[PDB]
Structure 1
Amino acid sequence: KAYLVGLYTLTPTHPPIQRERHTGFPVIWGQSLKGVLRSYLKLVEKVDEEKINKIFGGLISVGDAKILFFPVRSLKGVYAYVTSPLVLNRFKRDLELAGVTEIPELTDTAIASEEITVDNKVILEEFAILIQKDDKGILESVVKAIEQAFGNEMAEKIKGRIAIIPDDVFRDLVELSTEYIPSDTLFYSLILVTPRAKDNDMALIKEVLGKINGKYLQIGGNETVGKGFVKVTLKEV
């Protein structure tokens, strides 16, 4: 049994940023995320401190939050949600691990919505990447996956502003575009239920974790100056 956590930053978020060593991608460590989830249920949702211990300590596993979509300045559409084959493939494989489409390799080309495309080009910051026709409906397939994983609300935000760009460009942008993770960044994370869990426990998990969906949490430093506020989604599989 698995739960899908979405983390959409509403303000610049600072989890020296926490980055994955061999990629350089920003990441929210599972240790940190588990902490804020624990604190939110104890303080805001008023869950009994007996139910919390029974679930966190454990009974579930809170994985590190990877990055799915990163907001980047765009010439047409003001900004686009950019991602990459590598990132998307990791997302598909993490869905497999949780129980739950072919995405090609891009080198110097991109696949983007027609709302951010101008003269067969998408202009991200200063990068001017050539688009290639979206055959076999890649974009429409990513949007559907976003809907399933995070809900209809998240899919509407992103739809119309998607751009799948080369892995190397995504890396460059994600490292050289602000310190703070920008607002309008979408993270995702797996919550896995341990095999040692009994049938009586699954009802507890579903009840307590269910409270998290659609709420607002604070992650990382600088809470007092409006940093690290995120909207969380949570769905079963």
Structure 2
Amino acid sequence: MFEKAVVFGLYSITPVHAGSGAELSVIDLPIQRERHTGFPVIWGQSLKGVLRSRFRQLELDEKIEVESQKWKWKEKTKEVLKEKADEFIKKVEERKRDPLLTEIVFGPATDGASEHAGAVSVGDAKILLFPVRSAKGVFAFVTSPIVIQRLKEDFELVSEIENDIELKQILSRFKVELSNNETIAGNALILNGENKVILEDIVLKVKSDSNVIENLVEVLKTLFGDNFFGKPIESIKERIAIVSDDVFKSFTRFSTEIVARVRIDAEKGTVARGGLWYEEFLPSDTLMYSLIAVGSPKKENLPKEVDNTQKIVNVLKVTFNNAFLQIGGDETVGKGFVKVRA
């Protein structure tokens, strides 16, 4: 199925730490990666969980603009389920089940996991842009041809859903290959000397094929609105660098933030037993995308307001657009705040 697709773009306002599994190796709590390549990633389970929680919390306040009507959980449930609805309302009061809209879209709760599946699917969020310190200029966005390759693959997958031939052609228009150390750099990052763009601890050579970079910016303008998540897109167009695969992988491993944290005793004035530990944080301004898919709503006796893939897609688009999300652990210490552009 999955007759409709919405691309979600995330911008990290603050450093984000999505907790990995067992805390092994030298670093205590590392970010989630993939052994297959080594790049950072966010598994779809956490994304679906946070989206479901936000959706349910919004629905409980009757702030969800269901076709600009502010659908009421109790009223809609009574209209749909009729006689038994009241009983379900009690289950909603006990925080056992969930209101009608979120149950229909994201699937039911644990105790009722035998009626219908979830009408949505949330893919893993993959990196697309990585901040990196630079000598001239500051804070250069970086990316690699493999990322663009995966992006083209995702576009092709979308085309198998909505027949977006123009998007496929636009993606196929871009084809670059930096060999070992040369980079495609914007005008700002270029050192005042002859080429020689210096990223972190590496000195590179610029390559004069910047049109491709421009095309990439166009793709962004095609995908995530006009302003680049609240900034002038052309402003970011001056600070984009494309580098080889191995260099990008090296950046995605030895440039995440590393932080040491301690606990202070009540009155001793110094650390205590089991107080010192380490954490790894994904840098701010990291751009990561995903792929949300929607198929046929499998819920029984769905409401007339939301009874087609187009309706669900519109609801998701309006509810999540320039909104804000809390992602991962370390919430109370200001970590995980992101801006979502659909």
Q: TM > 0.5 between the two?
A: yes
Determine helix, strand or coil for the equivalent of 2:45.
helix
Which runs of no fewer than 5 residues in structure 2 stay unpaired?
19-29, 65-72, 74-98, 108-117, 160-166, 168-172, 257-279, 299-305
Q: Residue in 2 aligned with 1:5?
A: 8
Deviations 1:116-169 (A, max 9, x none): 11131221111111111025x101100010111112211346311100011101
CA distance in 2, matches of 1:171, 1:43: 38
Which runs of no fewer than 5 residues in structure 1 stay unpaired?
none
Counterpart amino acid of 1:43? Answer: Q
Q: Residue in 2 aligned with 1:147?
A: 221
Is structure 2 residue 122 aligned with structure 1 residue 62? Answer: yes
Q: Residue in 2 aligned with 1:105?
A: 177
Counterpart amino acid of 2:39? Answer: F
Is structure 2 residue 291 aligned with structure 1 residue 190? Answer: yes
Of residues 319, 328, 331 in structure 2, which corresponds to 1:220? 328
Q: Residue in 1 aligned with 2:149?
A: 89
CA distance in 2, matches of 1:156, 1:40: 32
Q: Residue in 1 aligned with 2:212?
A: 138
CA distance in 2, matches of 1:50, 1:208: 15
Counterpart amino acid of 1:114? Answer: N
Q: Residue in 1 aligned with 2:77?
A: none
CA distance in 2, matches of 1:73, 1:52: 42
Is structure 2 residue 240 aligned with structure 1 residue 162? Answer: yes
Length-normalised TM-score, structure 2: 0.65
Length-normalised TM-score, structure 1: 0.92
**2:142–2:243 CA contact under 8 A, matched in 1:** yes
- Determine what percentage of the aligned residue pairs are the same residue: 52
CA distance in 2, matches of 1:65, 1:212: 16
Q: Residue in 1 aligned with 2:315?
A: 207
Richer in strand (by share): 1
Counterpart amino acid of 1:14? Answer: H
Determine helix, strand or coil for the equivalent of 2:11.
strand
CA distance in 1, matches of 2:130, 2:200: 13
Determine helix, strand or coil for the equivalent of 2:217.
helix
Counterpart amino acid of 1:159? Answer: K
Q: Residue in 2 aligned with 1:38?
A: 52
TM-superposed deviation, 1:19:
0.5
Counterpart amino acid of 2:334? Answer: G
**2:174–2:216 CA contact under 8 A, matched in 1:** no
Say how many residue pairs are matched. 233
Counterpart amino acid of 1:113? Answer: G
Q: Residue in 1 aligned with 2:133?
A: 73
**1:51–1:204 CA contact under 8 A, matched in 2:** no
Is structure 2 residue 124 aligned with structure 1 residue 124? Answer: no
CA distance in 2, matches of 1:162, 1:37: 30
CA distance in 1, matches of 2:317, 2:187: 38
**2:297–2:309 CA contact under 8 A, matched in 1:** no
TM-superposed deviation, 1:202:
2.5
CA distance in 2, matches of 1:79, 1:208: 33
TM-superposed deviation, 1:200:
2.4
Task: Quote the RMSD (CA, aligned, Å).
Answer: 1.8
TM-superposed deviation, 1:103:
2.2
CA distance in 2, matches of 1:201, 1:68: 28
Determine helix, strand or coil for the equivalent of 1:153.
coil
**2:40–2:252 CA contact under 8 A, matched in 1:** yes
TM-superposed deviation, 1:102:
2.8
User: Higher RCO, 1 or 2 (CA under 8 Å, sep at least 6)?
Assistant: 1
